[PDB]
Design a protein around this ligand. Structure first.
Ligand SMILES: Nc1nc2c(ncn2[C@@H]2O[C@H](COP(=O)(O)O)[C@@H](O)[C@H]2O)c(=O)[nH]1
Ligand SMILES: [Mg+2]
Ligand SMILES: [Mg+2]
Ligand SMILES: [Mg+2]
Ligand SMILES: [Mg+2]
Ligand SMILES: [Mg+2]
Ligand SMILES: [Mg+2]
Ligand SMILES: [Mg+2]
Ligand SMILES: [Mg+2]
Ligand SMILES: [Mg+2]
Ligand SMILES: [Mg+2]
Ligand SMILES: [Mg+2]
Ligand SMILES: [Mg+2]
Ligand SMILES: [Mg+2]
Ligand SMILES: [Mg+2]
Ligand SMILES: [Mg+2]
Ligand SMILES: [Mg+2]
Ligand SMILES: [Mg+2]
Ligand SMILES: [Mg+2]
Ligand SMILES: [Mg+2]
Ligand SMILES: [Mg+2]
Ligand SMILES: [Mg+2]
Ligand SMILES: [Mg+2]
Ligand SMILES: [Mg+2]
Ligand SMILES: [Mg+2]
Ligand SMILES: [Mg+2]
Ligand SMILES: [Mg+2]
Ligand SMILES: [Mg+2]
Ligand SMILES: [Mg+2]
Ligand SMILES: [Mg+2]
Ligand SMILES: [Mg+2]
Ligand SMILES: [Mg+2]
Ligand SMILES: [Mg+2]
Ligand SMILES: [Mg+2]
Ligand SMILES: [Mg+2]
Ligand SMILES: [Mg+2]
Ligand SMILES: [Mg+2]
Ligand SMILES: [Mg+2]
Ligand SMILES: [Mg+2]
Ligand SMILES: [Mg+2]
Ligand SMILES: [Mg+2]
Ligand SMILES: [Mg+2]
Ligand SMILES: [Mg+2]
Ligand SMILES: [Mg+2]
Ligand SMILES: [Mg+2]
Ligand SMILES: [Mg+2]
Ligand SMILES: [Mg+2]
Ligand SMILES: [Mg+2]
Ligand SMILES: [Mg+2]
Ligand SMILES: [Mg+2]
Ligand SMILES: [Mg+2]
Ligand SMILES: [Mg+2]
Ligand SMILES: [Mg+2]
Ligand SMILES: [Mg+2]
Ligand SMILES: [Mg+2]
Ligand SMILES: [Mg+2]
Ligand SMILES: [Mg+2]
Ligand SMILES: [Mg+2]
Ligand SMILES: [Mg+2]
Ligand SMILES: [Mg+2]
Ligand SMILES: [Mg+2]
Ligand SMILES: [Mg+2]
Ligand SMILES: [Mg+2]
Ligand SMILES: [Mg+2]
Ligand SMILES: [Mg+2]
Ligand SMILES: [Mg+2]
Ligand SMILES: [Mg+2]
Ligand SMILES: [Mg+2]
Ligand SMILES: [Mg+2]
Ligand SMILES: [Mg+2]
Lengths: 97, 38, 51, 118, 110
RNA sequence: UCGGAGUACAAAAAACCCUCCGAGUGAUUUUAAUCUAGACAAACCAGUCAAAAUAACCAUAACAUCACUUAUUGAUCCAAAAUUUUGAUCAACGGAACAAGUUACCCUAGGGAUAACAGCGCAAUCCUGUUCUAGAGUUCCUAUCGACAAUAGGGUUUACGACCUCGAUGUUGGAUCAGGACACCCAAAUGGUGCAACCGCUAUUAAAGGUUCGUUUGUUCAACGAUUAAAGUCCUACGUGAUCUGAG
RNA sequence: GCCUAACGAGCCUGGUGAUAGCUGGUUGUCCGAGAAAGAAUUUUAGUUCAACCUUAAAAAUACCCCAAAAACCCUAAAUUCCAAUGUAUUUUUAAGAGAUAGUCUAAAAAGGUACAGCUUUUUAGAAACGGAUACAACCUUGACUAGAGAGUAAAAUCUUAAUACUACCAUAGUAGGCCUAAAAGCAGCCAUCAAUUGAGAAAGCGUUAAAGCUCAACAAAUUCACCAACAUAAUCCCAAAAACUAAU
RNA sequence: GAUUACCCCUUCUACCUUUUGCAUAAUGGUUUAACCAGAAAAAAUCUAACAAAGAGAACUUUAGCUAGAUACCCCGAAACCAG
């Protein structure tokens, strides 16, 4: 047990998650050549990457969304003035006065 | 099955009991009793 | 929320349509598989011998 | 009849102390959710089962990330008793393409870009 | 026994198309036992009091002022007894027509 | 069988040997055509609306009306009619062309999907206590009682439910042997009395031991004779038929 | 009744492999998906249609769904309908059967006794190898294989058992006026004044009417003082135990 | 499950059938051997031939035709009729 403490300290609630306990390559050849990587770590890599990619994507989509909206506001405000520049000069009531 | 209103007080579903027990009134407790103050 | 209700309108409609095009496409591809000589002929390898 | 349920908007008007309490900034809302499915969909109505399925929350105690836009917040609001929602944090910022392999997600809800240098 | 024959199936009186839907000419918009919804623009009334679309288009519901036909004794009496400021309102169904009435094409150049 | 209202509070649908009203048609003349886009409704069968276009008529003239208008209805086949139709309390109302009793003389297949015995649930009925005192008790609420009501228990009775058993859980009363509860009939110890004494009437505590013999009834009850310190109330598959009885 | 040990109609052979919507039975291994009932019916022990579902096949949108929108007296939880958005589903085509005798829990109702482990509908849920001692239906839990690893979930003794209220003192108009055999503070009706520092034309007991006891009044003093308590069953009680060494 | 160790410890309410639900005190079986129960090609799908035609006659065809392969149990009444 003791997941609560482990969480306050910023580690994984389960010692099995993501610590140097799990991540590191638990064996190597006596000569010092590295061992073929571990299936678990491979999968964890792939899905951590998948996650990251997704974070990027959503962030970018939300940004591009907000920018698109701001642009549409600007276009509206530009059309309100595009009415006035393109307008005819009011004559009739003003000429007598 | 019993009607909504009954004579006999009608045992609650356990989860409702837990609700009742968590939401009981707690009276405020002064730091020092006003009697034992000057 | 980060965005307002109107700020998110269609904010990704491009991705959503794309996804559905992929879903469709994956199903459209379903057809009986190709049949090759290596199979029907390769069966004869059953009786291969030393002589 | 047991039915679906309205949730009055007053519930979602935050008190000024809550900002201090849960660690949110009064000024700027966070961008992303890390949602986790903490409870089980069994013994719950089919519609919550569906909402959980379409949030990608199928597997328990696995994190998933979602936009903080209202479209999403609606569904989350339906199932909020089945889940844990914590704001995504980026101390090192968003990952570039060189940093994709080294990314990891720490339990305080923060995404670290460079994991295990040398 | 004393009570008898209360048993008859529902009539499925209801409102078939709803605000904002598309419709084709001849679709039944609603069916009712008494007038609940009155037919508005481009909506025909059947002899069973059901409302159907006379035009292809989009359904819209609306509250509007009710001025009965003077050949109707009952309604004119009800209207006649009102305090001088009051106006009967009712609920109407319209179809805002979609396609243009027709087009002009070039048949032959002589 | 058909319809209206409630059940079924706001789209639809929605049950009961559920609560309530109805229909099995009149009256009338405006005698209410042909053909066809699109729909409603719907297991099927049946039901519903309906534009445009024709033809009838003012010479650009198509919703029969009223009675809550909703319901006033019936498939195939088959019969009668001859040109175009009509025909069923086929009301068991999706309709067998035409058929009733009775069986303890019964049979088979099944069913604990479903009764009679017993259990279980429940506690209307039944039984206990306390709570409340208007009243009875000459006076005096609570010596002894106690209406109108209140709170809680018990699980004997009659039901109610149909959960175990119908490839069998054999049923009333006796006999024999009794196990248990205490809500005590006797024996013991006490409180109160409208307890002087003898009797009594109440209440508390106590369940080791006791709780008769006969006339009539198949009887349990009940009545009666004689007695007893007393002749308890109950539970145990209304204890006990691989121990007996068989009157019922 | 009897007709060769079974006669409500013998036996034998053949019809005969009679026919059973009824019971029983139905034989290798491993894998993929996977079902609780709307409609008719001499039908409710069964069928045949729907809705689901399975195997292939074609497609395109499918759920989720913010405003806007859906009735006339009053009326809730909420439905209907739909963009966006989150997802990968849905619809048609072609083949198919099984199933259509249902339980409890929560919710809205009806019936019943505001009874049932009761019955009838509507919305939701469940049918663990973990927990609630035992347990179908409550609670935890997206059911793979091997480990002598790890983290978590639901979850294990429920509180209260509470009701002390004591000293002191009492004399005056006057049996106040009435009705009554008597009504002297005290069957009843009306006034309710007045001496003394102080004591009601009297709040309880008491008398035939009194007399007589107490209350409120002075003085004497002064801890605190509103309400609150409720018997029981039948073979043998039913884990053992325990008020502190630090527990989100 | 284990274990140095047979037990001792710990954890598990036989199996079929029938059912809303069976450890059930609901059904069946002492046990062993041998016997003892899914059968059909209209439409469909799959594979192949040849194809505006195909089939070794007779038929069918607005991609069809021809062929092959894929499918539907066992025991039991009381009766009824003839000799
Ligand atoms: N009324 C009527 N009887 C019919 C019909 N079809 C057959 N029938 C039968 O034909 C028979 C005529 O003989 P009936 O008994 O009338 O003299 C009856 O058994 C009757 O039931 C029909 O359509 N209508
Ligand atoms: Mg793994
Ligand atoms: Mg209920
Ligand atoms: Mg009705
Ligand atoms: Mg009905
Ligand atoms: Mg429809
Ligand atoms: Mg016309
Ligand atoms: Mg019938
Ligand atoms: Mg019928
Ligand atoms: Mg019908
Ligand atoms: Mg017939
Ligand atoms: Mg006889
Ligand atoms: Mg006889
Ligand atoms: Mg028999
Ligand atoms: Mg039964
Ligand atoms: Mg049944
Ligand atoms: Mg019997
Ligand atoms: Mg009886
Ligand atoms: Mg018995
Ligand atoms: Mg019984
Ligand atoms: Mg029994
Ligand atoms: Mg009781
Ligand atoms: Mg008296
Ligand atoms: Mg009993
Ligand atoms: Mg009862
Ligand atoms: Mg039942
Ligand atoms: Mg039986
Ligand atoms: Mg037996
Ligand atoms: Mg005894
Ligand atoms: Mg006693
Ligand atoms: Mg005695
Ligand atoms: Mg005794
Ligand atoms: Mg009995
Ligand atoms: Mg007996
Ligand atoms: Mg006997
Ligand atoms: Mg015997
Ligand atoms: Mg015996
Ligand atoms: Mg014989
Ligand atoms: Mg047979
Ligand atoms: Mg049948
Ligand atoms: Mg059987
Ligand atoms: Mg199931
Ligand atoms: Mg019939
Ligand atoms: Mg079917
Ligand atoms: Mg809306
Ligand atoms: Mg939509
Ligand atoms: Mg059936
Ligand atoms: Mg039930
Ligand atoms: Mg249900
Ligand atoms: Mg257990
Ligand atoms: Mg699971
Ligand atoms: Mg699951
Ligand atoms: Mg005094
Ligand atoms: Mg007692
Ligand atoms: Mg013990
Ligand atoms: Mg049963
Ligand atoms: Mg079944
Ligand atoms: Mg069991
Ligand atoms: Mg049993
Ligand atoms: Mg046994
Ligand atoms: Mg049983
Ligand atoms: Mg038996
Ligand atoms: Mg058995
Ligand atoms: Mg049986
Ligand atoms: Mg069997
Ligand atoms: Mg046997
Ligand atoms: Mg064929
Ligand atoms: Mg088959
Ligand atoms: Mg015959
Ligand atoms: Mg016959």
């Amino acid at each position: 047990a003791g997941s609560q403490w482990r969480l306050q300290q910023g580690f994984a609630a389960n010692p099995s998650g993501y610590g140097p306990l799990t991540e590191l390559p638990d064996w190597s050849y006596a000569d010092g050549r590295p061992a073929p990587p571990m299936k678990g770590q491979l999968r964890r890599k792939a899905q951590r990457e998948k996650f990251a990619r997704r974070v990027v994507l959503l962030s970018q989509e939300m940004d591009a969304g907000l920018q698109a909206w701001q642009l549409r506001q600007q276009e509206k405000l530009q059309e309100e003035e595009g009415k006035q520049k393109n307008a005819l000069k009011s004559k009739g009531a003003l000429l007598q006065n | 099955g019993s009607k909504a209103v009954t004579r006999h007080r009608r045992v609650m579903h356990f989860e409702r009991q837990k609700l009742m027990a968590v939401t009981e009134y707690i009276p405020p407790k002064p730091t020092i009793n006003p009697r034992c103050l000057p | 929320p980060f965005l307002t209700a109107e700020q998110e309108r269609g904010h990704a409609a491009v991705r959503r349509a794309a996804a559905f095009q992929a879903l469709k496409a994956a199903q459209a591809a379903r057809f009986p598989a190709h049949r090759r000589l290596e199979e029907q002929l390769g069966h004869l390898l059953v009786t291969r011998k030393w002589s | 009849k047991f039915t679906r349920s309205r949730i009055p908007d007053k519930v979602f008007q935050p008190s000024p102390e809550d900002h201090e309490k849960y660690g949110g900034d009064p000024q700027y809302p966070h961008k992303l959710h890390i949602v986790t499915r903490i409870k089980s969909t069994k013994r719950r109505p089919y519609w919550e089962k569906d909402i959980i399925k379409m949030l990608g929350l199928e597997k328990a105690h696995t994190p998933q990330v979602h936009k903080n836009i209202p479209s999403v917040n609606a569904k989350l609001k339906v199932v909020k008793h089945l889940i844990r929602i914590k704001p995504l944090k980026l101390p090192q910022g968003l990952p570039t393409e060189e940093d994709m392999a080294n990314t990891c997600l720490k339990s305080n809800g923060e995404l670290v870009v460079r994991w295990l240098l040398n | 026994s004393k009570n008898l024959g209360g048993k008859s199936p529902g009539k499925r009186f209801g409102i078939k198309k709803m605000e904002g839907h598309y419709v084709h000419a001849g679709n039944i918009l609603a069916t009712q036992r008494h007038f609940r919804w009155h037919p508005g623009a481009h909506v025909g009334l059947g002899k069973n009091k059901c409302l159907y679309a006379l035009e292809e288009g989009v359904v819209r519901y609306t509250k509007e002022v009710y001025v009965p036909n003077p050949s109707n004794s009952e309604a004119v009496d009800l209207v006649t007894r009102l305090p001088q400021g009051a106006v009967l309102y009712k609920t109407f169904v319209h179809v805002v027509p979609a396609k243009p009435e027709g087009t002009f094409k070039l048949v032959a150049m002589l």
